[PDB]
Amino acid sequence: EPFLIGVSGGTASGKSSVCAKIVQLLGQNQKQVVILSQDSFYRVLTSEQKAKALKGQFNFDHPDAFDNELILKTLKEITEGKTVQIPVYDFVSHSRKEETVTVYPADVVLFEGILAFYSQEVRDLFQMKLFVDTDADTRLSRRVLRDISERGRDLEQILSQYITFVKPAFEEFCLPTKKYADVIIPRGADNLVAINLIVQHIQDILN
Amino acid sequence: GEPFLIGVSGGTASGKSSVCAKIVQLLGQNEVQKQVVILSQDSFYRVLTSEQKAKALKGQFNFDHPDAFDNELILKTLKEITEGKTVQIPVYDFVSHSRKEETVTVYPADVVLFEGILAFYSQEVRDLFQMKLFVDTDADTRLSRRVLRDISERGRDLEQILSQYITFVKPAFEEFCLPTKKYADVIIPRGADNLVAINLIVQHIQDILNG
Amino acid sequence: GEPFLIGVSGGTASGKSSVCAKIVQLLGQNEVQKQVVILSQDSFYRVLTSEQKAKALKGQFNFDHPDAFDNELILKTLKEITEGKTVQIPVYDFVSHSRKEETVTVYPADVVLFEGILAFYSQEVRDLFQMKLFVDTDADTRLSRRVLRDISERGRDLEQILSQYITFVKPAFEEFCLPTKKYADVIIPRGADNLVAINLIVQHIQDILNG
Amino acid sequence: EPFLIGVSGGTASGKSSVCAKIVQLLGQNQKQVVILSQDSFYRVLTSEQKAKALKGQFNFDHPDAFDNELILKTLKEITEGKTVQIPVYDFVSHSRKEETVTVYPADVVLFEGILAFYSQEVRDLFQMKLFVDTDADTRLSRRVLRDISERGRDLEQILSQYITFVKPAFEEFCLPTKKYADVIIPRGADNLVAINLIVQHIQDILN
Ligand SMILES: N=[N+]=N[C@@H]1[C@H](O)[C@@H](COP(=O)(O)O)O[C@H]1n1ccc(=O)[nH]c1=O
Numbered sequence: 001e002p003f004l005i006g007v008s009g010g011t012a013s014g015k016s017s018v019c020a021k022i023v024q025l026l027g028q029n030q031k032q033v034v035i036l037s038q039d040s041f042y043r044v045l046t047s048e049q050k051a052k053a054l055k056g057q058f059n060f061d062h063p064d065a066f067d068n069e070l071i072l073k074t075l076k077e078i079t080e081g082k083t084v085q086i087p088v089y090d091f092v093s094h095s096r097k098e099e100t101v102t103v104y105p106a107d108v109v110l111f112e113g114i115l116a117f118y119s120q121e122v123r124d125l126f127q128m129k130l131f132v133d134t135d136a137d138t139r140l141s142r143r144v145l146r147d148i149s150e151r152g153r154d155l156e157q158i159l160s161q162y163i164t165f166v167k168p169a170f171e172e173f174c175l176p177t178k179k180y181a182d183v184i185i186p187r188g189a190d191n192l193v194a195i196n197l198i199v200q201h202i203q204d205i206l207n
Numbered sequence: 208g209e210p211f212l213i214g215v216s217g218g219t220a221s222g223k224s225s226v227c228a229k230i231v232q233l234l235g236q237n238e239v240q241k242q243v244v245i246l247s248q249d250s251f252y253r254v255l256t257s258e259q260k261a262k263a264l265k266g267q268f269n270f271d272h273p274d275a276f277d278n279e280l281i282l283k284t285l286k287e288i289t290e291g292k293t294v295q296i297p298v299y300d301f302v303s304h305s306r307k308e309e310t311v312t313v314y315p316a317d318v319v320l321f322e323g324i325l326a327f328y329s330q331e332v333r334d335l336f337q338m339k340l341f342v343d344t345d346a347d348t349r350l351s352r353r354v355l356r357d358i359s360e361r362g363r364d365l366e367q368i369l370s371q372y373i374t375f376v377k378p379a380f381e382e383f384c385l386p387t388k389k390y391a392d393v394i395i396p397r398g399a400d401n402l403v404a405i406n407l408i409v410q411h412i413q414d415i416l417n418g
Numbered sequence: 419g420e421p422f423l424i425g426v427s428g429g430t431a432s433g434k435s436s437v438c439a440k441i442v443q444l445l446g447q448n449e450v451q452k453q454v455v456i457l458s459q460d461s462f463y464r465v466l467t468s469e470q471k472a473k474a475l476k477g478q479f480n481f482d483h484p485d486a487f488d489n490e491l492i493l494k495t496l497k498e499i500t501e502g503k504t505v506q507i508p509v510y511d512f513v514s515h516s517r518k519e520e521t522v523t524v525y526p527a528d529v530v531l532f533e534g535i536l537a538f539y540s541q542e543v544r545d546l547f548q549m550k551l552f553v554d555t556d557a558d559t560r561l562s563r564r565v566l567r568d569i570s571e572r573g574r575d576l577e578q579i580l581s582q583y584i585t586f587v588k589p590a591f592e593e594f595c596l597p598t599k600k601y602a603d604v605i606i607p608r609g610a611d612n613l614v615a616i617n618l619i620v621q622h623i624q625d626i627l628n629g
Numbered sequence: 630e631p632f633l634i635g636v637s638g639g640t641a642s643g644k645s646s647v648c649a650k651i652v653q654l655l656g657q658n659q660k661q662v663v664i665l666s667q668d669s670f671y672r673v674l675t676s677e678q679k680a681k682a683l684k685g686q687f688n689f690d691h692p693d694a695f696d697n698e699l700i701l702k703t704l705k706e707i708t709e710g711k712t713v714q715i716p717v718y719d720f721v722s723h724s725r726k727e728e729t730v731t732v733y734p735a736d737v738v739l740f741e742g743i744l745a746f747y748s749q750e751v752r753d754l755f756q757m758k759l760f761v762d763t764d765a766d767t768r769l770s771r772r773v774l775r776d777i778s779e780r781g782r783d784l785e786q787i788l789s790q791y792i793t794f795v796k797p798a799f800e801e802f803c804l805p806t807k808k809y810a811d812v813i814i815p816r817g818a819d820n821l822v823a824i825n826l827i828v829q830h831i832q833d834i835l836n
């Protein structure tokens with residue numbers, strides 16, 4: 001049975017880097033590990049919803065924006081040792097592509113996303129839940145640079161979409177889930193002492 | 208017969224200037240008038256040596272550090288305003304990073320509002336304030352306003368000010384501004400949009416002015 | 419004809435109970451009277467399972483965590499007080515970590531003050547408050563008061579509560595209480611010794627009660 | 630010429646551990662290093678001042694409580710390559726003992742104390758100035774445990790001496806000196822990234 005860990009936190013808090021660090025420190029001193037991200041499981045937009053998204057009028061930080069049924073199904077079979085296929089989604093296009101990614105059974109499975117703990121059925125599947133905590137302006141400055149490079153978008157649009165959707169959804173949806181975490185990590189990936197404790201806690205659950 | 212000096216502080220783009228503006232508008236609207244003037248710490252920068260202007264061109268000068276401001280001039284100016292004297296304040300050209308020859312004459316008023324990220328840093332200036340307010344707005348709300356404010360300049364690269372913020376502005380806020388927070392009489396969450404708190408401050412000022 | 423509900427929060431030993439006491443004393447002293455009652459979040463702890471009481475004996479139970487409190491009961495009780503109903507609040511025995519059979523009858527009042535480190539955590543409870551205050555006292559002032567408060571118990575080892583503070587209380591304050599700070603109408607530095615801020619709060623309450 | 634570094638910060642902020650870390654990370658990848666502490670240079674108390682100290686009525690966090698002339702003299706000769714003798718002071722007794730400690734010339738000299746940057750003449754002797762920054766309650770909890778073990782004193786006395794003398798003197802005397810530091814270290818000795826930058830900055834000033 002795979003030991004799967006939920007990881008959450010606000011945007012640009014360092015969730016994906018925290019898991020990458022967990023793998024790198026797990027490999028030294030072979031348990032096989034795979035990292036899935038909730039951003040892969042965005043919903044299939046209709047043409048109306050797609051038009052709203054191009055007008056900047058769609059909330060992609062709302063729980064309903066994620067294919068929670070597919071997340072629950074994909075995670076369910078992973079816990080049952082099966083091989084799963086994982087969608088690939090294009091943030092620029094807001095489309096789920098036809099190609100998928102094969103994920104073979106592993107010993108540890110990190111699932112990363114801003115709302116990984118929102119759904120109770122999904123939440124109870126994680127044997128361990130981590131919440132990454134980072135200063136808001138630090139996250140925003142990472143968010144702004146990331147969104148300029150990763151999608152070539154305008155600065156006035158990033159800041160207006162942040163204030164309209166990202167920040168309110170963080171406070172209404174993501175931040176309340178912090179109470180479900182087993183370990184809260186301040187300073188994100190820079191908290192190597194916290195990560196070390198987590199890594200050794202994983203290693204001795206597997207022994 | 209003596210001016211009522213009010214100190215306002217808080218992080219960059221927390222709403223220090225707006226909160227003072229709102230106070231001024233609410234003072235005159237609820238009058239019966241009272242003369243009130245607004246000063247800003249950003250007028251009292253030190254004139255840089257060409258050695259320091261060189262570091263500034265390389266982006267290696269901390270403008271958010273206490274050493275960047277003429278505190279001797281800040282204290283002297285505020286000490287004279289409290290005593291009812293008329294002061295001359297300098298005008299700083301930021302491209303040149305120097306003081307122009309012109310000054311600005313600031314006459315005494317019933318209320319004198321001084322705003323600055325480091326308004327409460329020095330104990331001598333902090334004690335001149337008969338009321339001290341702290342605007343508590345939030346890093347990501349403040350940063351987003353700070354960026355669009357700073358990007359209105361022609362040569363300001365985005366990654367330049369995003370890096371000067373992380374290197375200088377955010378640390379200096381936590382190292383020098385936040386410790387002064389305790390000294391405030393009142394801490395205003397969410398800045399100028401907090402009319403509940405600002406209404407109570409304005410009505411507290413009116414009571415002091417009316418004996 | 420409906421009770422005015424006021425939420426007070428802040429860290430441990432910040433002065434939440436004193437600030438409410440000062441407000442109550444100042445309300446009656448400046449009257450003409452108004453009935454006002456004080457509730458505390460520490461009455462609404464969950465009753466522990468003997469599995470959890472075991473972890474508590476080992477010092478491995480987080481009493482500063484949101485899960486440690488009966489928020490369903492907190493919201494239901496406060497919802498009924500706002501509607502003018504009369505509520506029964508439980509009495510918690512902390513040695514036993516259980517609710518006694520006795521309740522306490524709390525009648526509606528003109529002003530209802532609810533104090534708690536996590537008073538503003540849940541949005542549904544936070545919205546019941548027509549006024550929200552945050553006491554901002556300081557870690558070392560608060561810790562020193564917290565220790566002498568907690569050491570008045572016979573079996574409380576010093577290094578036990580100094581370790582439960584570092585492990586549970588200080589993190590929970592930063593993880594769950596501080597984010598709610600923005601929602602307050604007014605943030606009071608230095609707690610109950612800040613009579614400037616408390617006087618403006620009390621006079622703001624009087625105005626609401628007088629139409 | 631020795632390269633001497635001033636280190637300051639509030640009580641129990643980790644000043645002495647920060648320098649110890651600096652030495653340990655300097656030795657690996659031999660430059661010889663010695664750590665002096667300002668607590669060694671407390672003044673010679675008269676019998677009146679000593680009586681006040683036993684009654685808990687003496688401010689040991691005030692700049693006048695330190696033999697600033699001896700500090701300036703001792704540091705002056707160290708910069709001039711000479712060998713110096715260093716007093717030893719007993720906090721329990723409030724006495725300067727007759728024995729001294731010989732300090733032979735070194736390549737780097739760390740000087741640690743809560744008011745190391747207060748005196749301007751002393752301050753200008755440091756080629757590098759560090760300020761250690763730590764949460765107040767974290768420092769106090771370290772202060773309380775340290776003062777119970779190190780001097781066997783009563784808890785009510787520690788907390789009353791802290792509120793009366795230590796905390797006010799920190800805000801009036803020590804904290805303003807933070808503006809003189811070249812590097813401010815948040816989280817104290819846990820900020821290994823900040824320390825690393827300092828260590829490499831020292832190594833390349835010596836090369
Ligand atoms: N728009 N928007 N908000 C989003 C949310 O912050 C992020 C998920 O957060 P994180 O990847 O940092 O864990 O997906 C973001 N996002 C951004 C651009 C886009 O085109 N689509 C999209 O989903």
Ligand SMILES: N=[N+]=N[C@@H]1[C@H](O)[C@@H](COP(=O)(O)O)O[C@H]1n1ccc(=O)[nH]c1=O
Nearest residue numbers: 218219220249270271301324357371376
């Ligand atoms: N760079 N930088 N930091 C600065 C400081 O934080 C700010 C003070 O004003 P506020 O309250 O808007 O942040 O002015 C900024 N500043 C200073 C000098 C300069 O030449 N240009 C400039 O933008």
Ligand SMILES: N=[N+]=N[C@@H]1[C@H](O)[C@@H](COP(=O)(O)O)O[C@H]1n1ccc(=O)[nH]c1=O
Nearest residue numbers: 429430431460481482512535568582587
């Ligand atoms: N331990 N611990 N943390 C507690 C929490 O922070 C505090 C809440 O009240 P305040 O505002 O005084 O901190 O009660 C403390 N608490 C809780 C349960 C218990 O059995 N004993 C106890 O002291």
Ligand SMILES: N=[N+]=N[C@@H]1[C@H](O)[C@@H](COP(=O)(O)O)O[C@H]1n1ccc(=O)[nH]c1=O
Nearest residue numbers: 639640641689690720721742743790795
């Ligand atoms: N009393 N008192 N305050 C002191 C100050 O906090 C400390 C210097 O701080 P730090 O050692 O943490 O750098 O010396 C302390 N101190 C304590 C006990 C004593 O008997 N003598 C003494 O000087």
Ligand SMILES: [Mg+2]
Nearest residue numbers: 016037039112
């Ligand atoms: Mg991601």
Ligand SMILES: [Mg+2]
Nearest residue numbers: 223224247322
């Ligand atoms: Mg301004």
Ligand SMILES: [Mg+2]
Nearest residue numbers: 434435458533
């Ligand atoms: Mg209380």
Ligand SMILES: [Mg+2]
Nearest residue numbers: 645666668741
């Ligand atoms: Mg020491």
